């Protein structure tokens, strides 16, 4: 029952410091190496660092050398990544993963043990500004297919940093919902839309509310979206 649980991720401003945790259980902690692997929003995997029990077996990727320090408490069965002089491009989900204790000594053209177990990840956002979103309705057409489909939505504008989450009717309405990837505007703030297709016959009698949550500024917005004039 091998388990890796990462924790201690949150929001940090450039140059600040943050300390992450990987609590491990279900295995002899010694026979194994712990690795940090990160994934920027919408990017591929990027290896960060590793430690095997003692400080003698560690190494770091060049992108991170000098700024980050990995450590371990064999007593507590936990690995730590101390992150310093952070910048915007350190923003990523940080995973911890288990490898072989002496994976480096083993490595050859014919052997690569890989990383067998992974955690669920911890989000690290490095924010320069904060700004809660603006929520404008995307009002359904009066020229809707009268026995057919109609589309309505929410434009979620001018917020920082990511993420925003959008649900409809508190999650009671899931079918035909399309929330888009945020796109960074030239102004330097993110923007996205959430649309839903519905039966047109409902527009008169059924209520539709989008629920925007911006956790990084504790703003939550609820706009009833109604047909126009």
């Amino acid at each position: 029952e091998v388990q890796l649980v990462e924790s201690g991720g949150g929001l940090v401003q450039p140059g600040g410091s943050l300390r992450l945790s990987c609590a491990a259980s279900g295995f002899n902690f010694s026979y194994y190496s712990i690795h940090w692997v990160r994934q920027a929003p919408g990017k591929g995997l990027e290896w960060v660092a590793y430690i095997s029990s003692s400080s003698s077996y560690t190494s770091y990727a060049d992108s991170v050398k000098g700024r980050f320090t990995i450590s371990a408490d064999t007593s507590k069965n936990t690995a730590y990544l101390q992150m310093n002089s952070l910048r915007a491009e350190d923003t990523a989900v940080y995973y911890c993963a288990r490898g072989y204790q002496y994976w480096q000594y083993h490595a050859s053209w014919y052997w690569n043990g890989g990383l067998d177990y992974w955690g669920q990840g911890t989000l690290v956002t490095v924010f320069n500004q904060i700004k809660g979103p603006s929520v404008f309705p995307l009002a359904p057409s009066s020229k809707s297919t009268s026995g057919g489909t109609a589309a309505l939505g929410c434009l979620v504008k001018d917020y920082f940093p990511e993420p925003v989450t959008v649900s409809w009717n508190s999650g009671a309405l899931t079918s035909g919902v399309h929330t888009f990837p945020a796109v960074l505007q030239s102004s330097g703030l993110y923007s996205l839309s959430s649309v839903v297709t519905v039966p047109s016959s409902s527009l008169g009698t059924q209520t539709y509310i989008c629920n925007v949550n911006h956790k990084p500024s504790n703003t939550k917005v609820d706009k009833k979206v109604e047909p126009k004039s």
């Binding site: 990727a61 014919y110 990383l115 669920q120 990840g121 309705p137």
Partner: protein, 210 residues
Amino acid sequence: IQMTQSPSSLSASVGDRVTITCRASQSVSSAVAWYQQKPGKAPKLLIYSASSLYSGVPSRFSGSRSGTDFTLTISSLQPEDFATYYCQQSSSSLITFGQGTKVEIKRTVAAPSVFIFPPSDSQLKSGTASVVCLLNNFYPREAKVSWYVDNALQSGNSQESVTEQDSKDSTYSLSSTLTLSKADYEKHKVYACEVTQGTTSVTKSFNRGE
């Protein structure tokens, strides 16, 4: 820098044979491991030491060498195999992952449902107009969206966003946003986005006010 993976993305039906290549960093001889990742989930190990199947991995998957490169083959693509695939090397003291490969479901052509939405009054009071064109539930991904404002083709003032493939119907959706000053929005009447997929183009519009 990371390693190149041969097809960056590809589309295939359930039942097809699929081959991804991994190009090792010039002079770097290191058995490759392969991982599978699904949106919002941790990577899972598939193959290790170039060609050894990890526990609980079905054997439609296989790994192999190919000259000085490495290949991952899925012999009979299953619905649960649509994901992103990364290779991985351990040259000296550094681990390095590949750029990744998206495997997407091939599917019959569908034409977008096009809706246009004018700026809210709420929004105009802030001095900015956002006009939104929604292409809903089409395939394949390639589609062209053009904005016309009183028959003036717009450029440099729109931004697009595409969903990932719907889990139920395998289609995409796409939003285009035209951004204008309230000053500029207010001096024109006719707003239109035109959507071309293939031979057919579909234009939706509105007149400001109506």
